[PDB]
């Protein structure tokens, strides 16, 4: 029943859709990789924080980290060009990501594409 090669990689999505999707599920520390919109062969790393924007009744704040792609590698903010998103993401899944302000984005739930129905 739909058994094959699954993963977190989505394909096409906009920072506007992610925030809606990620939140829709309601899973903290949920990251999802999507293709850029106005960037050259680039991607965007969207992660759902376990912290609400307001309080009890508001959606979880998301973090869009511009993902740079150098030919066949990936990086964010720094030069560290991972062999692939699988490594760049995994490394963060254990270590995590640090935002300028200080926020620590953790990736434990590999947001899967999901059967787009409806």
């Amino acid at each position: 029943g739909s058994s094959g090669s699954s993963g977190w990689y989505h394909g096409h999505m906009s920072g506007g859709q992610a925030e809606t999707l990620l939140q829709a599920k309601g899973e903290p520390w949920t990251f999802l990789v999507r293709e850029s919109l106005s960037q050259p062969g680039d991607f965007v790393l969207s992660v759902l924080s376990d912290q609400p924007k307001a309080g009890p009744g508001s959606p979880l704040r998301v973090t869009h980290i511009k993902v740079m792609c150098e030919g066949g590698r990936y990086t964010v903010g720094g030069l560290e060009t991972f062999d692939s998103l699988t490594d760049l993401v995994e490394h963060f899944k254990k270590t995590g990501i640090e935002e300028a302000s200080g926020a620590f984005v953790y990736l434990r739930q590999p947001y899967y594409s999901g059967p787009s129905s409806g």
Binding site: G15, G16, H64, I65, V76, G78, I97, E98, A100, A103
Partner: peptide, 15 residues
Amino acid sequence: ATEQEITYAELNLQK
């Protein structure tokens, strides 16, 4: 107008 241009986080590194 009233567009939705989400902002990205400016991670911090050696830089």
